[PDB]
């Protein structure tokens, strides 16, 4: 319908959002696929109501409220991620979660306030460009976390992981829009499989095809401070 196609064109965006809320690729992709299946199986109705992307995210949230699969206040990490990775406003965030825009702002504020109360953890960065590594590290330290080290190659990473085993890996392998550095991602995911692994990339859609083993957390390049904080804070929740 070009519309029904526009909804399937936002499926990788939902895979990213679902992977972050569940902390796993397998679980995130499964829920993201079942959301599109149900939207397709529905005959018309409730459309035109929303823009194609927002409607798919809204369909996700309707099921998210029934069942997931406490410490953090519910609805807050959801609104924060929608704000950080998708750039949604409080008004679009209110439409997706079916709350007033002022209430959606309260979700983001409470999320940002609990991030200030988070317990410290250890992060290792894999990064070649020095100036990026030092800016990323400065953010992680202002967050209250400790930077184990900066491995300039994925060869170095196994060394620094032995000396001090972090609880989180930040990786930027200077990937491109090619499919060449596909085995490099699989290697780093397999090495640190028991750790949450965030990948910095300028082409997130390439890592959002539920075909290969892919990360559950992503930092879009060029990065924004807020989206780096959201990624690390979300990943340093499934850390041990």
Author numbering: 3 to 71, 89 to 259
Study text:
The GSR is a gene expression program that enables bacteria to cope with a range of adverse conditions such as oxidative stress, heat shock, and UV exposure. This response works using a so-called “partner-switching” mechanism, whereby HK activity—and subsequent phosphorylation of a downstream PhyR regulator —controls the activity of a transcriptional inhibitor known as NepR. Stress activates an HWE/HisKA2 HK, phosphorylating the PhyR and promoting sequestration of NepR away from σEcfG, allowing transcription of stress-responsive genes to occur. Exploring downstream effects of RT-HK, we identified two homologs of PhyR in the genome, RT-PhyR and RT-PhyR′. In the structures of both RT-PhyR and RT-PhyR′, we observed a typical arrangement between the SL and REC domains.
RT-PhyR and RT-PhyR′ were solved as a crystallographic trimer and a tetramer, respectively. Unsurprisingly, no electron density was present for the disordered loop in RT-PhyR′. Aligning the two PhyR paralog structures shows a reasonably high degree of overall similarity (2.7 Å Cα RMSD), with a notable major shift in the position of the loop connecting the β3 strand (immediately following the phosphoacceptor aspartate) and subsequent α10 helix (α3 in standard REC nomenclature). Adding other PhyR structures into the alignment (left), it is evident that RT-PhyR′ adopts an unusual conformation not routinely seen in other REC domains. This large-scale shift in RT-PhyR′ is likely related to the unique position of a conserved Q residue (Q193), which “leans in” and diminishes the solvent accessibility of the phosphoacceptor D (D191) (right). Two residues in the α9 helix of RT-PhyR′ also adopt distinct positions: a well-conserved R at the N terminus (R173) and another R at the C terminus (R184) “reach out” toward the typical position of the β3 loop and α10 helix, respectively. Notably, RT-PhyR′ was phosphorylated only at the longer timepoint and without a marked illumination dependence, suggesting that it is a nonspecific partner. On the other hand, addition of BeF3- to RT-NepR′-equilibrated RT-PhyR′ did not cause any substantial spectral shifts, showing that RT-PhyR′ binds RT-NepR′ to the exclusion of BeF3- rather than cooperatively. However, the analogous interactions seem to be inverted in RT-PhyR′, which exclusively binds RT-NepR′ when provided with both RT-NepR′ and BeF3-, suggesting a negatively cooperative function for this homolog. In contrast, the absence of a conformation representing the final inhibitory RT-PhyR′∼P/RT-NepR′ complex strongly suggests a phosphorylation-independent function for this homolog, the details of which remain unclear.
